[PDB]
């Protein structure tokens, strides 16, 4: 005679306490790691600050901006106390607060170097957004300062902590595509000069470059970790409508071709004049991987294609096997510290992309191939 299992039969029919429920998504754990967010801009307020909620070891300790009115408003929304609101002048004072373990620099590309360096002098860990800086030299000075302060330097490569991108790298390493031979990337988005956030991006001094530096870097970096190797030479070409006021100083569209030591090739482009595009294609001799969206803030989708098949993968509809890229990025530094472990996106990684972006820019300017076989080594893997 079929009867209910023990567990079900033991459940009281009256109000009673029960055990900790099964977890189907990352549960909050602690808030030991305190960050100091610098630059309350579009990315900071739209993605990063809201991203702390899901963190399992991170919290917002202080804010840093030149707009006190805004800073006050953003502080009240995140319970940050007014007393811990720094401006770009007193920033160095963060040194007097041991509760500020690290700083997260979300300022224009040109101001990354200086504040990162000032942050290390203040004896703090540094989370710096990409592109690292607007010059290779500055990246090195950022790295030296990191070593000197004996703190960690991490670049905001969210995709290195995105579930779907991680799944993509895994299937590739498992040889589901076979011998890799051709990678294709495209990253685009219509430039709106009226958007406060986009205005400095049109300034060569502030941005360091056009679409490549801002978004093309996703195809560049992605080609590198998807392939799991570095380019030995690059060739490129760029074109911008001469009559378009948006590109007087920075490039609109640029295309770059690369060759790797394994024999694999790649061709990708970035654009400021075409609508939303984030697509990566990795061709092997067994199958072809299509990541589309490839690097979105949300809804990434990948597919392994073979004649007659399209095996798609995306985040589940009810469970959450891994944390979102933002919250995961924030906790990755926090964890690297408390565990005395190297970071997956070290300053050396961000410097590699800057060097590569310069070799690419130089290739487009000269119209000749630029050797990039300078022996960079990815510590810890891709």
């Amino acid at each position: 005679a079929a009867t209910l299992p023990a567990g079900a039969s033991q459940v009281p029919t009256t109000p009673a306490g029960r055990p900790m429920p099964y977890a189907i998504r990352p549960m909050p754990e602690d808030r030991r790691f305190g960050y100091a967010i610098v630059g309350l801009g579009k990315y900071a307020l739209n993605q990063i600050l809201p991203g702390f909620a899901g963190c399992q070891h991170s919290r917002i300790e202080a804010l840093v901006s030149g707009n006190a009115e805004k800073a006050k408003i953003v502080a009240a929304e995140y319970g940050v106390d007014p007393r811990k609101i720094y401006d770009y002048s007193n920033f160095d004072k963060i040194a007097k607060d041991p509760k500020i373990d690290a700083v997260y620099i979300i300022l224009p590309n040109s101001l990354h170097a200086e504040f990162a360096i000032r942050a290390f002098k203040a004896g703090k860990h540094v989370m710096c957004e990409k592109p690292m800086a607007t010059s290779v030299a500055d990246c090195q000075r950022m790295i030296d300062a990191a070593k000197a302060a004996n703190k960690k330097l991490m670049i905001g490569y969210r995709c290195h902590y995105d579930p779907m991108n991680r799944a993509a790298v895994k299937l590739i390493r498992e040889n589901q595509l076979g011998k890799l031979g051709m990678v294709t990337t495209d990253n685009s988005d219509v430039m709106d000069q009226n958007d406060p956030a986009q205005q400095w991006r049109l300034r060569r001094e502030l941005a360091g470059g056009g679409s490549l530096m801002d978004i093309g870097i996703y195809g560049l970096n992605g080609t590198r970790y998807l392939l799991g190797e570095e380019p030995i030479e690059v060739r490129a070409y760029t074109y911008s409508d001469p009559n378009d006021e948006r590109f007087v100083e920075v490039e609109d569209r640029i295309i770059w071709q690369m060759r790797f030591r394994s024999g694999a090739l790649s061709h990708g482009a970035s654009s400021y004049s075409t609508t939303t595009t984030s697509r990566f294609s990795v061709q092997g001799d067994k199958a072809v991987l299509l990541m589309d969206p490839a690097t979105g803030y949300y809804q990434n989708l990948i597919s392994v294609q073979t004649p007659g098949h399209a095996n798609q993968s995306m985040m589940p509809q009810f469970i959450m096997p891994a944390n979102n890229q933002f919250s995961a990025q924030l906790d990755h530094l926090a964890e690297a510290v408390i565990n005395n472990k190297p970071v997956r996106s070290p300053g050396e990684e961000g410097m590699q992309d800057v060097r590569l972006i310069q070799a690419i820019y130089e290739a487009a300017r000269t119209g000749r191939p630029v050797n990039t076989d300078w022996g960079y080594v990815r510590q810890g893997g891709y």
Copy 2:
């Protein structure tokens, strides 16, 4: 060819800039305080984490029968430890004005009593689905809400899910033409070892099987997609008699309904088959496929015609609408703040319970059950 003024006027040195463009819901305030009742699977996996994205809501207190757990959860959400209640002193919430409403996330059979006690404590009530395990209990919850002059809202997250609302919108815009056939399926493998599932296998606590638990999504969904109520239902249920999970509640049940407009629907719910959340709405111009239809995340809808499949889902960079969980929480807040009725009132929850009761009767007797009792959806679907 010169650079725009805005670009040219941006300083080369560190300086303050204006409030950035918002591409997703920004936090605004935390004026509506909630007392969360029942630190279970839904509370800790979806609800509490959903407060962060709210624009007018916050966690003020916790109500639990497990002291150690309550402390751990309170610490994780910065909840004042002195604001942790148990099921005995729950009534004392009446003394804290910072507690605007309560959110009942307890087993179905306990919804009514804690909802009514909450109204006597002068609080607004947010209660999870299914509303209750009897039509009479639903009514009492409603009588209590009116006596206390407080709002009663049932946890129909799909009533605040972007994709579901987009689905309702195109249907109302007549993109499918004349509606004639809806198909629904909601399923998931019942694991009797999961503490959260244990009470679901008990008739006294659950009030029913898969229909009361997840089939209700198809039922409720069929109603808001067609934008009308069923006037007749038929159904059949079957469960493996040797499976210990279904000794008291149904595993699989199939229900068929007819609407005044002439539209028909057939749907099912299952406790023994893997994850399924699929809705289909056939019109004479196009067919809508929602799959996933009612997920926590990743919903996807598609309007299909010969040679075309127009899919819609949440964007990859922008977020034009708040997630269903945060939106649901704020909806009660805003309704109270702005003196407006809620989209998912107690009457809506009660309609489902009555219909579910009718479906069970139909499956029991094997005869059709008339449901043409004139229910009116206040404020639309």
Copy 3:
């Protein structure tokens, strides 16, 4: 060392020269041994079947049977059929005098399947008959009896039994990729247009035998059966049609039926004459869920096995054709069955089973009570 070209490439002449038979990436024509007499030059015959012969590997059109001489003459010319090989419904029986007519393919209104199938067997021919088999269980049996008496094969036109994607779906299910099966859902619909000549007999119960269930719901019914690989033991149903709609005065528009199988699996499906194109099947197991959509299209079928975080889709390739199209395959299947003295996958008994089940479903809808269908049908040769 340094690479050199392989022998094959190095041996290719640089001048015009004959080469070997090429690699095959699609079914190649082979012969035209099996001759068909097509009965009823209507919508299905002219849009799908006659054109479907070109892709066959053993079948050909030998003669035509039509009641419209003007039309038969035109079609005969389009397919190179001997003008003398055109029969009408009166001299039909004379096909017995032509040895090059191995079989007939009845593509007539449902109510006329039985008599022409029987006249064909008496004419000593094999028979391919469209679905639904007939309009009465008794007539189905009369067709089977006539086949047995003539010692000829009887095959029903279940094209999906020879459709690549449907076979792929059946295969992954048998491989247990979905786990234990518990819930099947089907929907088959298309807007009925009474001004279409082909639909006019479908609105007449005497000619059609029934409404949407008999016409297209049968795909959901038959599909549930070969997807689960078993037979229902009981059915329950309900039907409804706008009482003021002239299309449904004699046959049903929408009908919903649910069934239970001996394995314990359940199913709920529907067919509709008033909603647009729908051909969707879903099979839920405790390990995965299969979604076939399109499920039974003339073309472009697509299937997907879904699990949290995954959707593995399968469809016909873009450059190769691993298996022949369902129409050509169906036709060749009877041909090969005769030549190799083997039974067909879709025999008269299979078609009769659906007709019995459909009658049971209509009965259940009419009485509002369940109907026991545990009558012991056994699928010879598997599903």
Copy 4:
């Protein structure tokens, strides 16, 4: 008081003749235009011959083959009169048969010109497979011979008669994508030297080139008809594993990028060492078009993408609004001759591709950009 409509009530209950039925797919009409198929190879026997069945005005009249035994086998399979089987020596005798309206050259690239010219001298129209020829000069010779015999010259660009490709061109011209700015193409497939058909493809003298001449041309030609304009300059690079016996004479992978007079850019590639890929992407400032499969023999699929939307189109599941590309291509020449109209894919169109391919190879060899602003005008649109 509902009653049945006239049509239904008038249907006899006994066997009776009925009208012509509604057409839901292209119906056969006539077989007035006769072809002589030259070269019974992989494409001919797998796609072209089987493609005649779906034609509305075309038929196979004769076969030209160097393999007499294969020719007789194929002849019997298609009801071709045994006497209508020619070989490469008596090929010119087709001039004596008025039933042969045209020839279809499905021979190796290097032999196209030769037989097309002999066909024109034979007074026949000519359908010739792509790539047109292995030299620009040979392309012109074919055109000259066409004009000399006053017969039409059409190149086998099936995609110019493929429903989905046409649908893609139509929506672009309707401005559903906005201002076009970036096109990406990829056409790949694993080269198998054991396949008799691929053996001449590895011979430069017979192929004229590697993957670009064979399948890259789809991306090239596609970029042109999707943009609806011509490139004014190209840049390219190619690489092939030096130890692979497959690429001793022809290239494996080649990447090319182009700039158009409208300002639009493009970057594509073709590969002989990676599995099945046929993907076209067209980015505008309003939407992005993804064609994938882009140029398949079957199952093409297109999708217009915008944030939160993916509107896909493909061939219906029950109706066939337009004929398949193969039958359509064959009928296109037939209709053009019968209606005294030019063909959508004239010799000049095939020649443009060959010239552009020459420019791309030249650009790959010199590592310098090549100007292609030579004034080609698409007669009749793309």
